[PDB]
Amino acid sequence: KKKKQSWYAAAGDAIVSFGEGFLNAW
Numbered sequence: 001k002k003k004k005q006s007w008y009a010a011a012g013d014a015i016v017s018f019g020e021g022f023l024n025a026w
Contacts, residue, residue, distance in 0.1 A: 005013060
């Protein structure tokens with residue numbers, strides 16, 4: 001019902017994308 005990304009899915013996706021986001025100032 002309510003979950004699209006499990007803990008590992010989010011932790012992978014979220015953190016990797018976080019880094020992508022971070023590079024916007026580089």
